[PDB]
């Protein structure tokens, strides 16, 4: 649970910015 | 007065200038299509 999915969707936002 | 009907005329020309111009070019093209030639007129 949470922390890992927040890391993955954190990487998804990393793809959202650039 | 003349200024009031002048404003009505300019406002109405503003209201119909679009289809007046495009429909006017349609008038030029269609009257270019349906025009009689003069040599047939002298012929009759």
């Amino acid at each position: 649970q949470e922390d890992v999915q927040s890391s993955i969707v954190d990487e998804d936002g990393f793809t959202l910015v650039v | 007065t003349a200024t009031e009907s002048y404003d009505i005329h300019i406002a109405r020309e503003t209201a119909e200038l679009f289809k007046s111009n495009i429909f006017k070019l349609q008038i030029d093209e269609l009257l270019e299509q349906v025009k009689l030639k003069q040599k047939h007129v002298l012929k009759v």
Binding site: - | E16, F18, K19, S20, I22, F23, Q26, I27, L30
Partner: protein, 487 residues
């Protein structure tokens, strides 16, 4: 539009041509208003002048509610009194210009004047090819709604007192000079009083009429159509009112103590079809009660009885084409379906009533997620199902109607499409548990939906009512488009 200066009183479409157009606009350049104000100016463009003519023809009546006064030798003055005839009256020459026009030709001319005026008021789409480059009078089946083929074998003149139901004596030769003028006027009156508000407009056509004949003859001689008069047959062309055409009861005068004039014209006009009825509001009226048909409208029967009663016993009215177009409709397995009119949608209404009986029961069930919407998107809800909805006829593919189902906006919807559609599935399992729990008259099961590519987990809820109809339920959420555009 087939409009010309030719005599429309002979059963043609005309009376108003280019010459009457130029007299009309030339009269508009010398007034035209009610208080003799000028409608058109000499400094206008041809769109402004022509638009003023179409606006005058669309807005100002010259037949019933007014006429136009003008001077050929002084301002044009519109008068609000009509002579029950298309009236365009010169004072200098005392000539009514529109004498060649009939009443229906002027009402149809005003109708095309209003259609054309609305097309000139369109500022989005182009109507140039519509107004000036489209032929509507090439085919009457496109121009008109109905066309009745009327055969009239009238023979000679001395046969007319035996073949015409009316009397063509001296006075009809005085006012109505020919046979075809009193014929078109008479059939126009019988058909106009016969239908009334079931239609909107009508033209009567003498098919096969001629205006040319050689120098070796005195007049046009003919023998075709069973008579020696200048037509083959008579076509009845009809512009149909959609709101009042297929009603069961042709309305007549109200029944009172003393018989009025209109009740004598009514009962004289219908005879055995003239009757009395208490309406729904309790009014006792003279009327006519008819029967609808899925093969033909009532209008053919009214024109048939009116022309075979009041014009000629030898008339042969035929329109089998519209009978074919009604007959190629798939006749649904319903009681009195053959005696059901084409505009009736009562089976769709019964599916709507059974759907609302379903809607009240399902829409008030208790759930962990409250239903946002139960929205029908079926073809039978937009009345386009190719087969009309028959109870218990499940073999048709338009039987199960699709219904959109929406729950409350809640974060209980997962972030993966298979578990999302399986959550919709388990929600439909709770719906089926309540439905089979307490509404066992409604039958139900589950099916797959694989018409959407690569989403094999869509499960539709199929419900069969004791009214004999079936629905498939599908669920739409707000997480859907996020996952699809996400994908």
């Amino acid at each position: 539009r087939g409009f010309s200066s030719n005599m429309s009183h002979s059963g043609s479409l005309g009376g108003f041509g280019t010459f009457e157009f130029t007299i009309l606009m030339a009269a508009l350049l010398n007034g035209g208003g009610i208080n003799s104000n000028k409608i058109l100016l000499h400094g206008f463009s041809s769109y402004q002048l022509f638009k003023g003519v179409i606006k005058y023809l669309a807005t100002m009546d010259l037949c019933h509610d007014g006429h136009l006064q003008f001077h050929s030798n002084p301002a044009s003055k519109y008068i609000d009194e009509g002579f029950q005839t298309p009236t365009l009256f010169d004072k200098s020459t005392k000539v009514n210009i529109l004498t060649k026009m009939t009443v229906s030709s002027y009402q149809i001319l005003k109708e095309y004047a209003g259609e054309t005026l609305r097309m000139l008021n369109n500022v989005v789409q182009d109507q140039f090819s519509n107004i000036f480059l489209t032929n509507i009078s090439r085919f009457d089946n496109l121009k008109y709604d109905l066309c009745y083929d009327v055969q009239l074998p009238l023979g000679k003149y001395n046969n007319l007192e035996t073949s015409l139901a009316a009397t063509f004596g001296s006075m009809e030769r005085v006012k109505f000079i020919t046979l075809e003028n009193f014929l078109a006027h008479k059939i126009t009156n019988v058909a106009r009083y016969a239908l009334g508000d079931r239609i909107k407009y009508i033209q009567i056509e003498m098919v096969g009429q001629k205006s040319d004949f050689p120098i070796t003859k005195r007049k046009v001689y003919s023998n075709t159509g069973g008579n020696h008069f200048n037509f083959d047959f008579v076509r009845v062309k009809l512009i149909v009112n959609p709101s009042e055409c297929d009603k069961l009861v042709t309305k007549g005068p109200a029944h009172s103590e003393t018989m009025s004039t209109e009740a004598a014209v009514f009962k004289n006009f219908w005879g055995i079809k003239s009757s009395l009825r208490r309406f729904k509001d309790g009014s006792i009226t003279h009327c006519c009660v008819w029967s609808t048909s899925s093969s033909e409208p009532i209008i053919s029967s009214i024109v048939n009885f009116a022309l075979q009663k009041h014009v000629s016993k030898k008339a042969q009215i035929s329109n089998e084409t519209i009978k074919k177009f009604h007959n190629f409709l798939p006749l649904p397995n319903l009681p009195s379906s053959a005696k059901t009119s084409v505009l009736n949608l009562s089976s769709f209404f019964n599916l709507k009533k059974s759907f609302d009986d379903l809607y009240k029961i399902i829409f008030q069930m208790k759930l962990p997620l409250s239903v946002k919407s139960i929205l029908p998107v079926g073809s039978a809800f937009r009345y386009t199902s190719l087969c009309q909805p028959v109870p218990f006829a499940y073999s048709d593919p338009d039987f199960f109607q699709d219904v959109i189902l929406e729950f409350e906006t809640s974060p209980k919807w997962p972030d993966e499409i298979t578990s999302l559609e399986k959550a919709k599935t388990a929600f439909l399992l709770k719906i089926q548990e309540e439905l089979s729990a307490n509404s066992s008259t409604y039958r139900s099961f589950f099916s797959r939906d694989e018409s959407i590519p690569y989403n094999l987990e869509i499960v539709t809820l199929n419900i069969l009512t004791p009214e004999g109809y079936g629905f498939k339920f599908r669920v739409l959420t707000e997480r859907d488009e996020i996952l699809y555009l996400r994908a």
